[PDB]
Amino acid sequence: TRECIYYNANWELERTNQSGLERCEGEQDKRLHCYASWRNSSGTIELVKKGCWLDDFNCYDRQECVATEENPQVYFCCCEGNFCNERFTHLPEPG
Amino acid sequence: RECIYYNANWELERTNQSGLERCEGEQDKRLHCYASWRNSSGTIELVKKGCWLDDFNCYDRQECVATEENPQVYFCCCEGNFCNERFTHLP
Amino acid sequence: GLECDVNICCKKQFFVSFKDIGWNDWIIAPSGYHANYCEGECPSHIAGTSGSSLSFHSTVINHYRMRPFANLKSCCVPTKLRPMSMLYYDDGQNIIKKDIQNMIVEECGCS
Amino acid sequence: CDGKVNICCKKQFFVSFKDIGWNDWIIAPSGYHANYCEGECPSHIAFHSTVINHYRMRGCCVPTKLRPMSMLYYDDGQNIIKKDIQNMIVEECGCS
């Protein structure tokens, strides 16, 4: 099924790895997505988390990971498809 | 857990007649196999074999032993892999 | 507490014998099961709270509450159920083995 | 639901995090349809299900089915956490 890129900046306190893949689980009917999140205050990206994300209509049929909020403090994108969160961009939209 | 699978009613149910079944279960619970059969004056006719979710009736049983003495259709369950490959009646 | 012995919402141990309700003519196995049920009072001990303090869902309702959910009441209900295998005769008298969801009440809590 | 009986049923309700005050700690989603059950039980109109109600004809309105949801949010120590929360979205209601 669905594999996603996995990143946890908080690996230390939760006890995970920092970097990998994550294999997605979700019961029969439902979609499975990938996600990324990051900061960017001053031009330099600071990864927060990447991983699997449960069935969510805001992710339905998005093949690339594109954050769409106007001007967030934390950027978030979600997508469908294997390793879809390998790359991520920001493409703001009115809101 | 894995179990012997058998389905005498395979045609109508549109399954395979025989094989294995890998059992799946939630997190905190036991897995069991079952068998079921008719015994019509000295001759066994298999009804169904497969997996069986947690039931107390099956607990710490290595053996598949019939629960009842003279029912029209006999049932046993057991714990462990392929413990429903053969079975027995009560006394 | 959460398991019963006449009190707060709790889980009551109960065994249903299919022979006792007439269903042993269509059910082959099991001959009954521990269905259990929930019973008891739904008190308000914890300030700033309706029912379960851990449920996001009822914390959102609870928050939207304190500014069209005045009319709401809390019962003692199942919070966790577990499936059971059954071997039975369907209404054409074919023998079926099925995993039936939501058969056994494993835990109770106030809604 | 029905204009004639007060039956137990699912009512829609979208949660906006920016409305309630929760957008400062919740990054994603901006919100969602956290429905709710209202109506009157037991049901006379329309499997524990049946053992119950069948012992009942002879002897509350609540979520009978729910969807989990992922959330990215700030925890108490100001760290970003992602959790898959159970029982967030009522899909169906019924009488206990």
From Swiss-Prot, chain A:
It is found in: Cell membrane. Phosphorylated. Constitutive phosphorylation is in part catalyzed by its own kinase activity. Disulfide bonds join C4-C34, C24-C52, C59-C78, C65-C77, C79-C84. It comes from the Eukaryota. Residues 1-95 are extracellular. Glycans are attached at N17, N40. Belongs to the protein kinase superfamily. TKL Ser/Thr protein kinase family. TGFB receptor subfamily. Transmembrane serine/threonine kinase activin type-2 receptor forming an activin receptor complex with activin type-1 serine/threonine kinase receptors (ACVR1, ACVR1B or ACVR1c). Transduces the activin signal from the cell surface to the cytoplasm and is thus regulating many physiological and pathological processes including neuronal differentiation and neuronal survival, hair follicle development and cycling, FSH production by the pituitary gland, wound healing, extracellular matrix production, immunosuppression and carcinogenesis. Forms an activin receptor complex with activin type II receptors such as ACVR1B. Interacts with VPS39. Interacts with DYNLT1. Interacts with BMP3. Interacts with BMP2. Interacts with BMP6. This is Activin receptor type-2B. The lineage of its organism: Eukaryota, Metazoa, Chordata, Craniata, Vertebrata.
UniProtKB/Swiss-Prot annotation, chain D:
The chain holds residues 314 to 426 of 426 of the full protein. It is found in: Secreted. Belongs to the TGF-beta family. Dimeric, linked by one or more disulfide bonds. Inhibin A is a dimer of alpha/INHA and beta-A/INHBA. Activin A is a homodimer of beta-A/INHBA. Activin AB is a dimer of beta-A/INHBA and beta-B/INHBB. Interacts with FST and FSTL3; these interactions prevent activin A interaction to its type II receptor. Activin A interacts with ACVR2A. Activin A interacts with BMPR2. Inhibin A interacts with ACVR1; this interaction creates a non-signaling complex (NSC) that inhibits ACVR1-mediated BMP signaling. Inhibin A interacts with ACVR2A. Inhibins/activins are involved in regulating a number of diverse functions such as hypothalamic and pituitary hormone secretion, gonadal hormone secretion, germ cell development and maturation, erythroid differentiation, insulin secretion, nerve cell survival, embryonic axial development or bone growth, depending on their subunit composition. Activin A is a homodimer of INHBA that plays a role in several essential biological processes including embryonic development, stem cell maintenance and differentiation, haematopoiesis, cell proliferation and tissue fibrosis. Signals through type I (such as ACVR1B or ACVR1C) and type II receptors (such as ACVR2A, ACVR2B or BMPR2) which, upon ligand binding, phosphorylate SMAD2 and SMAD3 intracellular signaling mediators that form a complex with SMAD4, translocate to the nucleus and modulate gene expression. This is Inhibin beta A chain. Disulfide bonds join C1-C9, C8-C61, C37-C93, C41-C95. It comes from Homo sapiens.
